Amino acid sequence: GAMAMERASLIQKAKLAEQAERYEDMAAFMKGAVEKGEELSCEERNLLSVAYKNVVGGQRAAWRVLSSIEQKSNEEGSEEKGPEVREYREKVETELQGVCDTVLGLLDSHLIKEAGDAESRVFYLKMKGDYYRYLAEVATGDDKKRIIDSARSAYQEAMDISKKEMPPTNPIRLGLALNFSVFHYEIANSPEEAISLAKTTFDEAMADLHTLSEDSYKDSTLIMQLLRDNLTLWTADN
């Protein structure tokens, strides 16, 4: 009927925007598709994640560049320094916080649910943790504390589901532990937890690699290499 046609058109335009590298449009089209009320297939879920990941990804990069300039400018190295760096770093911050807020609102209002397979539920709760983590990267003081709590809560509920209903080699479970360990290291200043979680995730999956097909082996190992690389850097030294 009408809903299905309109939803199909939005999904189609989201794919066109992907090919045109119009990720803000892509995110808007997928947001609209979600609001049609139907659950997202695995493919559609990725389109949603890819869209907003590129949008916020560019903002995070821009924020990091401007913050670095701000530190040098505020250290008398550039000598006389104006407020323009801060004002522009704050504009980029506000834009990033708005996108995260939009994503978090959509997750709570349409995507996070008690029903659905474990992968979908884990996928969205992990997404909730990620975007609270992106807010944490730019937050300060009390707001940072609350956001960190919301991130840990979302990650933890996803961990509980993945450890109960998914095998140690599931790529979504692996990606979740990877991002949660990053949260431990970078956001929560808990390197011991980050190393422990990353080390446990790699080893417990390493033991099950021989049970995987040729494809599942590549999907799971692709993320295990990210875990090992982080461990090498975290364990080798500060």
Binding site: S49, K53, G57, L174, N179, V182, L226, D229, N230, L233
Partner: peptide, 10 residues
């Protein structure tokens, strides 16, 4: 970006 450790996205 400055950071060397990665998340699953990239």
């Amino acid at each position: 970006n400055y950071r060397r450790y990665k998340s699953v996205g990239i």
